[PDB]
Amino acid sequence: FMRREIKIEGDLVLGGLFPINEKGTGTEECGRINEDRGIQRLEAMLFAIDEINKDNYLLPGVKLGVHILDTCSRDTYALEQSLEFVRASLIPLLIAGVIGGSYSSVSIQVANLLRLFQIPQISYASTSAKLSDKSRYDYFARTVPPDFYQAKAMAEILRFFNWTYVSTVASEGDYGETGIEAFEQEARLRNICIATAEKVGRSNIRKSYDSVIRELLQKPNARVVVLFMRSDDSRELIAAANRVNASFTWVASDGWGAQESIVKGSEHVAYGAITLELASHPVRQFDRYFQSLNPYNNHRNPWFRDFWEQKFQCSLQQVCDKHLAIDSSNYEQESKIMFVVNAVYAMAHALHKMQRTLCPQTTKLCDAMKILDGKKLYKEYLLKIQFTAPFNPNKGADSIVKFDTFGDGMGRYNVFNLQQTGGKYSYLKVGHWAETLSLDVDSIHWSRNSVPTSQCSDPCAPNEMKNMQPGDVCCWICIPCEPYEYLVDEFTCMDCGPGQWPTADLSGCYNLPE
């Protein structure tokens, strides 16, 4: 009966799309609140707009409004909601540009719609490589990189610890499939074999997941499982492994990232997991803003109440303590917030340079810009380069926001390790990827305190077996050697020669008596 949205008027309006709510189960379209990647990212856009509307050097004279909608983590729903943005170009607010899409599937479908009406779009989290194709997504840009690189970071980590036999499980969609396709290619090149390639997807219940765990279990040697899955899917997969108490060493992409909500209730099954996330740094000023929010002062966000009640397990009108508050003990800035803020700022800077150009006499939205030329805006937005919203210290660690010729951001990632040292589970940065892998292996805590072994065949017996490679470079057979042969090396048996005999160790030959 009621479909929520945020509508704030302005001289120029920016549309927004966030997975405020998780996907609905069964017949319902929306489910529980997505606390970190939903509410936080939403308020980070509101935070950016407020800051911009108080900035005298950026769009002074032009107030930015917004029209933020919920995607409910589903491309189809996001798509239906976005129709709201195009009808406006005919109560309805004219959309200068759209900020959003977290899931690549929604960003892509939304992009297919938006280009039809020349509406620029900037995503702050969609990493699918498909989105780099300017012949299909010509009005799309993003402040994050294409998984073309993330897939390399993952394959190079496996190649490092010599994990040549692994299983993979990808989410159906443009994120999981294209991302896993990239990995497979990077794997072949580095002689890494895939034991079993699984995949879950749309409208999947426990059984589809339990069925995946079972199939992973049918490849016991492949103890390292490469994941390229959506957040929600990852959560389901780990819950499935927790039931049958299965245990593997997970290598997950940003979809999983450094989210604690993913492993909650199955912390021991995900212990030792290694995950990736886009290299970013918290926006300090945002921490202050978000923590100051509460059901009393934050009425413009129609999802905040539901949020509040779920985060604290509340109720208003077990009632809730009017003294609750978001703080350093219960809140941690979502990993990609920086990208949301930069996205909004990039659109503002683009509009700002356009207004300086077409309206040389005032700071106001002059007649020449009453009807925006979206095509020009995009080909004015692509060439944008600016120092990251003030909320970023220094400027030496290349803190400039700009875009590739494909409209992408820079491929930089951080590697994380799920630890628990202090009784509580948390992610610890254990490395990073810029162009080459980098990580200090010593700070890594593994599953079962031993650096995993993930190879095709069982190791050869010492006392007499030689390692033999068939046709591939992942599997082998062990050939016991003749009692008179020793192991010159791991794969070769050689006759000790007359008068000599192999040592018990088989490392050499000793002289025979008698």
Ligand X SMILES: N[C@@H](CCC(=O)O)C(=O)O
Query: Which residues bind to a copy of itself, rule: CB under 8 A?
Result: 79-80, 83, 86-87, 89-90, 109, 112-113, 115-117
Cβ atoms 488, 494 nearer than 8 A: yes
| Binding piece for ligand X, criterion CB under 6 A, among 126-134, 205-213, 404-412, 464-472 | 126-134
256 or 378: CB nearest ligand X: 256
Q: Which does 86 bind (CB under 5 to 8 A by kind): ligand X, ligand NAG, a copy of itself, none?
A: a copy of itself
Which amino acid, 400?
Answer: I
> Distance of CA 513 to CAs 94, 308, 484, Å?
98, 85, 15
Binds 161, which of a copy of itself, ligand NAG, ligand X, none (CB < 5 to 8 A, cut-off by type)?
A: ligand NAG
Smallest gap, in angstroms, from Cβ of residue 113 to a copy of itself?
Answer: 6
Work out what residue 125 binds among ligand NAG, ligand X, a copy of itself, none; the CB cut-off runs from 5 to 8 Å by kind: ligand X
**CB-nearer residue toward ligand NAG: 191 or 218:** 191
SS (H, E, C) 295-354: CCCCCCCCCHHHHHHHHHCCCCCCCCCCCCCCCCCCCCCCCCHHHHHHHHHHHHHHHHHH
Tell which one of 162, 245, 362, 469 touches ligand NAG (CB under 6 A). 162
User: By the 8 A CB rule, do 89 and 95 touch?
Assistant: yes
| Alpha-helical regions (H) of 399-501 | none
The C-alpha atoms of residue 104 and residue 83 are separated, in whole angstroms, by 18
Classify strands 165-171 and 140-142 as parallel, antiparallel or unpaired.
Answer: unpaired
Query: Is 271 known to sit in a ligand binding site?
Result: no
Do the Cβ atoms of 395 and 135 come closer than 8 Å?
no
**Is 495 part of any known ligand binding site?**
no
- In whole angstroms, give the CA distance from residue 121 to residue 99: 6
- Of 336 and 349, nearer to ligand X (C-beta) is 336
Closest contact distance (angstroms) between CB of 442 and ligand X is: 29
| Least distance from ligand NAG to the Cβ atom of residue 451, Å | 7
When asked if residue 34 is in the footprint of ligand X (CB under 6 A), the reply is no
| Residue with the shortest CB distance to ligand NAG | 162
- Contacts for 258 with CB less than 8 Å, ≥ 6 apart: 275, 277, 335, 416, 427
The answer to whether residue 128 forms part of the interface with ligand X (CB under 6 A) is yes
Q: Which is nearer to ligand X, 15 or 145 (CB)?
A: 145
Site size toward ligand X (CB under 6 A) is 12
Please, what is the minimum distance in Å from the beta carbon of residue 89 to a copy of itself?
8
| Tally of helices (H runs) and strands (E runs) in the chain | 11, 24
The angle that helices 104-114 and 75-87 make with each other, rounded to 10 degrees, is 30
Using rule CB under 6 A, residue 438 touches ligand NAG: no
Which of ligand NAG, ligand X, a copy of itself, none sits in contact with 484, Cβ below 5 to 8 A by type?
none
Does 255 engage in binding with ligand X (CB under 6 A)? yes
Angle at the Cα of 279 from the Cα atoms of 264 and 293, rounded to 5 degrees: 60
Instruction: Find all residues with CB under 8 Å of 79, minimum gap 6, and list them.
Output: 106, 109, 110, 113
Phi, psi (degrees; rounded to nearest 5) at 150: -55, -40
Output 321 or 490, the one with its CB closest to ligand NAG. 490
Rule CB under 6 A: is residue 104 a binding residue for ligand X?
Answer: yes
175 has binding-site annotation: yes
Is 190 annotated in some ligand binding site? no
Whole-Å CA distances, 305 to 41, 50, 66? 16, 21, 20
The span from the CA of 127 to the CA of 143, in Å, is 10
Pairing of strands 193-200, 500-502: unpaired
Note whether 130 binds ligand X by CB under 6 A.
Answer: no
Task: Name the binder of 162 from a copy of itself, ligand NAG, ligand X, none, CB < 5-8 A by kind.
Answer: ligand NAG
Nearest distance from C-beta of residue 319 to ligand NAG, angstroms: 56
Nearer to ligand NAG by C-beta: 491 or 510?
491
161 part of the interface to ligand NAG, by CB under 6 A: yes
Chain residues in the site for ligand X (CB under 6 A)? 37, 102-104, 125-128, 175, 254-255, 336
Chain residues in the site for ligand NAG (CB under 6 A)? 160-162
- As annotated, the binding site for L-glutamate includes 41, 104, 125-127, 175, 254, 336
